[PDB]
Amino acid sequence: VSRNDIGPSVVLDPTVKCPTLKQFNLSYNQLSFVPENLTDVVEKLEQLILEGNKISGICSPLRLKELKILNLSKNHISSLSENFLEACPKVESFSARMNFLAAMPFLPPSMTILKLSQNKFSCIPEAILNLPHLRSLDMSSNDIQYLPGPAHWKSLNLRELLFSHNQISILDLSEKAYLWSRVEKLHLSHNKLKEIPPEIGCLENLTSLDVSYNLELRSFPNEMGKLSKIWDLPLDELHLNFDFKHIGCKAKDIIRFLQQRLKKAV
């Protein structure tokens, strides 16, 4: 039930048990608060979707037992209670986009996918840097300043890291690079980056690197020639060291030229 005009106060009857329900789509309707009696009616619920609504206040404790896909994007919500996800030990793909959010209250250790773009995050919360099983993270279009290095992440299964439309001064990677050897995507567009550290050559599994739209980079390092898996590499609106975009320069032979330059630089 996902495009109707379901008015606020969508309280469920506490006298009915529906353990068969698995997916409960309540998105886009009108909701101002999360349904009150979820934990006593739809006990075996798996996916709860509430995007596009107008949920405002701090959410209910939500002690439902078997969440796997939670979606609270496109709301008008300021902050979450400190015990929001404490009693949902199987959450995997929490996502909260287009929300006036600031901090993350103790995500469960079973989290895998986490999308948090279009939120007013002054700095990346510490609760994300100690998730033991995180796989992808998307915090684009936020006003964060410092990106922590790969020795502060406590997770060996990073695969995507999207941070476009930010203002990150540095791309600190010389600390311990090999921990991010699993990373497949890395988007640093629209940031204030001036130079790429040479240690980016260690991330041998990179598949989609984006550092375009910086207006201050003006250079690439020679170590990037070891990033054989790259197939796309945007160079939109920034002046490089050579004239390009005549008939080729399709982001695959440029890395070949970079590797050859790394072989001998005369």
From Swiss-Prot:
Effect of residue 32 to C: In PARK8; uncertain significance
Record note on modification: Autophosphorylated at Ser-228; autophosphorylation is stimulated by RAB29. Ubiquitinated by TRIM1; undergoes 'Lys-48'-linked polyubiquitination leading to proteasomal degradation.
Highest taxon in the source lineage: Eukaryota
Disulfide partners: none
Record text on subunit structure and interactions: Homodimer. Homotetramer; when activated by GTP-bound RAB29. Interacts with PRKN, PRDX3, and TPCN2. Interacts with VPS35. Interacts (via N-terminus) with RAB29; this interaction is direct and stimulates kinase activity. Interacts (via ROC domain) with SEC16A. Interacts with APP; interaction promotes phosphorylation of 'Thr-743' of APP. Interacts with MAPT. Interacts with RAB8A, RAB10, and RAB12. Interacts (via N-terminus) with RAB32.
Domain notes from UniProt: The seven-bladed WD repeat region is critical for synaptic vesicle trafficking and mediates interaction with multiple vesicle-associated presynaptic proteins. It also mediates homodimerization and regulates kinase activity. The COR domain mediates homodimerization; it also mediates homotetramerization via interaction with the protein kinase domain.
Family to which the UniProt record says this protein belongs: Belongs to the protein kinase superfamily. TKL Ser/Thr protein kinase family.
Protein name per Swiss-Prot or TrEMBL: Leucine-rich repeat serine/threonine-protein kinase 2
UniProt organism field: Homo sapiens (Human)
The encoding gene: LRRK2
From-to range in the entire protein, with total length: 1065 to 1330 of 2527
